[PDB]
Amino acid sequence: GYDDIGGCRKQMAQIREMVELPLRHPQLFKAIGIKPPRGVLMYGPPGTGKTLMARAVANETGAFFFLINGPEVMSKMAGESESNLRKAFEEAEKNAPAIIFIDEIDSIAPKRDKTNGEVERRVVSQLLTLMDGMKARSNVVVIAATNRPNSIDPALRRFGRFDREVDIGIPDATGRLEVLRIHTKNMKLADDDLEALAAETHGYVGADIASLCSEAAMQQIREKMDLIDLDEDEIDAEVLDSLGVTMDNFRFALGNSNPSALRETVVESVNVTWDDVGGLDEIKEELKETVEYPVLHPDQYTKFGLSPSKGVLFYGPPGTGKTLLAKAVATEVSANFISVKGPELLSMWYGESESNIRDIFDKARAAAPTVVFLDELDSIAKARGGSLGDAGGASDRVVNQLLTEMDGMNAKKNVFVIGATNRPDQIDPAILRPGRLDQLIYVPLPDENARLSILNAQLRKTPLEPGLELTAIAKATQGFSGADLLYIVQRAAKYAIKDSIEAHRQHEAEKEVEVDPVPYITKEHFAEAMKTAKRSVSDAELRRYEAYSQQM
Amino acid sequence: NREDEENNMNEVGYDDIGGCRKQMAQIREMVELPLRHPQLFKAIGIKPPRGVLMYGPPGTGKTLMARAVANETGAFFFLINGPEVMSKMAGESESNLRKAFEEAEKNAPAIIFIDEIDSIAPKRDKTNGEVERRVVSQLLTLMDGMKARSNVVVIAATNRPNSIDPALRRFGRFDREVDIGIPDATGRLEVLRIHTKNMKLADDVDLEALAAETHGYVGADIASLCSEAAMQQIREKMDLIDLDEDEIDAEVLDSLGVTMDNFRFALGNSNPSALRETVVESVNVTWDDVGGLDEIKEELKETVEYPVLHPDQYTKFGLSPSKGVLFYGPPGTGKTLLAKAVATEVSANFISVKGPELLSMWYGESESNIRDIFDKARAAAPTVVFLDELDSIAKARGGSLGDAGGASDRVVNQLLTEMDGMNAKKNVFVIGATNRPDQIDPAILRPGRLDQLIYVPLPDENARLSILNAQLRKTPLEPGLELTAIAKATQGFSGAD
Amino acid sequence: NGPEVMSKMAGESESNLRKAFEEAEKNAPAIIFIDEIDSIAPKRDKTNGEVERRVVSQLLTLMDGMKARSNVVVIAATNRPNSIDPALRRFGRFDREVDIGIPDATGRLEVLRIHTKNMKLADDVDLEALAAETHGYVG
Amino acid sequence: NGPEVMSKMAGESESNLRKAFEEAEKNAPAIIFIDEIDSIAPKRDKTNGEVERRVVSQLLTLMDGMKARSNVVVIAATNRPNSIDPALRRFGRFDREVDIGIPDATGRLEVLRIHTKNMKLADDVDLEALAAETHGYVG
């Protein structure tokens, strides 16, 4: 029904008024002296419910309705498609002051610039003429449904054909909760907070909420038969009446779901925790509140009167865990996250690269809020001016596309770009400036206490000897990095594994003639691990980074 | 007579499908529960999913799964190959598909299966012709509209889901996307048991070792291995028996007994179809062919064989293993020969790539090729990848003032992100060999990319003696000759000299 | 022949492939030789046209699919296998790829005997020296 | 001629070659002349257009295949032999690579005598000195 749709109260009211007033009391329109339009378009991302709302309007309205669809108009017999559309319009007029709905107009709108066939051009012209031929007293409105607004014949945008359009965008989080509730009345609800589920759900739109609900219901059903051991013989009524989808089902469904827009750009589920990132406590806190304020308190930003910063650059020497911070943020952000690697976007075909940048940023804007992590931004941000002829200006085109798409982030949709480079000396001076990419976080070499924190964070899962003292290690290792400590720990683990395998083969020979002789790592393992331990830090690189930081 | 018997064994039941227990069970629920216990879906209130997308590398049994489900379910089944729908006549392909869907709905509740959707869902935005775009629009309309679906489910099969229109990958049209990837060792064990229970094998059959030693075979690959082994056994026995075109006695038909020699020979002459494009014939180098480097040989052998043979211990401590290693020293010391030896004895897969081989005159194909190679390496893991002369492909980014078009810098950035990025980093080991370690970028030599910097110094007198024994291990020699003099006289020479 | 199937009509090439395979199966237990596959397998990734990928999908369906093959064996010939779709290089579609490389001196001697059996040679000629001195001849 | 067979339309250049060869073998024992093959022989590895590979494969099939030729001979013409696919420069397709370089001074005299037999010049002028002065002038 009309109330069945939801989440777009303003647009539903607009369309309802638009469809009812010229259909309930068209006489008042004549009295006022306005000719109501005949064509009305709605355009939006896939799954927004445009077809749903059109079907509900067809249902809630008592007036007669007719459905047309793009791909079912053309036919093998010559000239019979145009006659089909013509007779459709004649019946639409002859029967009653009805309402006609054309689905997926984009199939019948090739922009007439790439359109080459003669039958398609003829059908487009016939429909244009018929639309223009709809007099004021036609008293029948046509409703067009386009998925993408750019691939539209501009002739159809002229007054008298399609003047009123509605960009039905992704609903608000509160609207998303309302839609979830719409889905949540029919099913059997457990005793327990959809408001939290919507406040945590960020990118999902319309059908995605339905997908989440269905997935949770399926999980609930899945637990029930396996425990009940229900077979093909029959169903047990005691199971049927004892059915309620709980909070854990929704947790599972959210953990197994992703927005349909991001279905292509899904990412491998690598798990990191805030205690895994040893050290960098102030960095971790500042990043977390900077990400938490625009996504939880938009009113607070308005009260402050200054919109938040958008870009940020993590820089430092490698093995300082910058990618680890990226992983941790991707794991605990309560928002969408798209990881992007530099050379991936480039394409040999002329223009395609910038097209890829445009579409990726289109998804980034669609699944707002989002966090686009550009790893190794240098590959893109190569400084230029003396390159002359080499790549073919295509790199310059890519840099220009990125620059124009980085300053064009309005207050709405709040998309944060995370940069990560090892050598900031090669970045273009344009991009580093405020207004397009402002924030610059520096990851220095870990402090000795931070070094101890990192060491303890890396051996969280490793069983360890009771009498193990790490303060000595810290006092010895002064200029090392997290990767170096990881290497030391892996060397110790490999030594322990070698000893365990030696003992196991000795025990197997004994059998031929506790299970783990070393259930944890030993001090001798650390002694041998530090015998082959070295630092990858280049003192000259350290000096260069220090000089650059001073220049900052 | 035989027709009835043939039909019974012809159908491949769900037991035939193996190694994909979780995904097979999930799809079996999705297909059966609304056709076995629909009442629960009326009682709970919600409708079941009515769309599924199978995706994964080829030969993964997805078509086998389609045949198995078709044989198991008694409901109506409609089969549509992807390109089959189109026709020369204008506006008939969509008419044909509409007629198919109408027939499917008219007869009974049914399962439609559309194979190779990648040819049929070109995303409707990058194509220039309109016939494809209108076919996509017609499919989208049938999946979404007045009476979008009426107690009929649609199964699709694809190899490149990322080249599909996003609207087709949406809930309501295709609700669940199943990812049927490479089977695990246990999965390969069940697949072997499935493929080895039909024919007659000798008592020496032991499938566990075969499943352990196979590293990247998926489905049809394993089947191929089995077939090859059997054929080799037939060649072992079709030689001793004469041509005898008229008829063959039972005694040769009986007591066939595909021996373990057949299985091992067929595994040595086979490789996964994924690496079929990149692999080349490899020369043979024994461990005794490599003189000296005893500690280095043992270190590399244990560092490669431990994750592949002892993964339980790694999970006991819950720590990841070391992956990379870089040998450096004067040329001809035996580094490339050592790499060849590692290729010859180690069980893990070997990917030999030359240094400047992968560079391209076009724009971006260097990094695209790097990504393709690394995807292949991580797909058929465990793998060993040898990067010969890293100083050819790896340099300090931006060092060369003269513009190269940024290719080298972008390549090095691709390498950096692949060795340290949003990677899974399961079972890929990078081996480097360069005799000028000053030209490599300082980031590559970092731990987590290349943690082991191994110097290969010059051999000593005892190592020169060991090398002499290794290279004089075949040619006949003088009984009265003692090489101790040769060692005492060679001081600065190398193995090649 | 390889490019023999491609046509201006949309989809007719795949229709021709269907007709070929159905006739091959309808007639007898046959052997089907498809020549020069390097033009009908551009990896589906470097190419940009639509008809060729559609043909590749049709071929992949023909080689493997519902009742893919019964008393039909497919042999193919090509000069470059690396420019071929991996989906065609799997068991069930193309089980085994045989290589035909450079013959040795003995191989050259049999080829010479084959090629020198019908003309009137002199009595002072020998094929051993010819097979030895010939090095890179492909037969 | 070379570029006149190429057709941007899918699967039509191959049809043109098919009709050309069918007519060539239909009529009588025939001599064929394919001008400027370098426009139809990009070696199948450098260029990215699939149409060139397809036409090369079709030409190879026509020049080599099951019951390829009957009483006909094919001749080619090119300015850039080094930029040709090696599969086209094989025995059984194009075995004799004949070269045509600049003629000698005697060649210049012969060409002049060919040119100056239908016109009418003066007695005083001789062609031997004229041929000697024309050093590199060809054809």
Binding site: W349, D390, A394 | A90, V131, Y363, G402, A407 | - | -
Partner: peptide, 22 residues
């Protein structure tokens, strides 16, 4: 009666060059 047809004409590529300075 009418009929449809497929068509694939060409595309546009970009090359990469190397320079030498002094």
């Amino acid at each position: 009666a009418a009929a449809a047809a497929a068509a694939a004409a060409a595309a546009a590529a970009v090359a990469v060059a190397v320079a030498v300075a002094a």
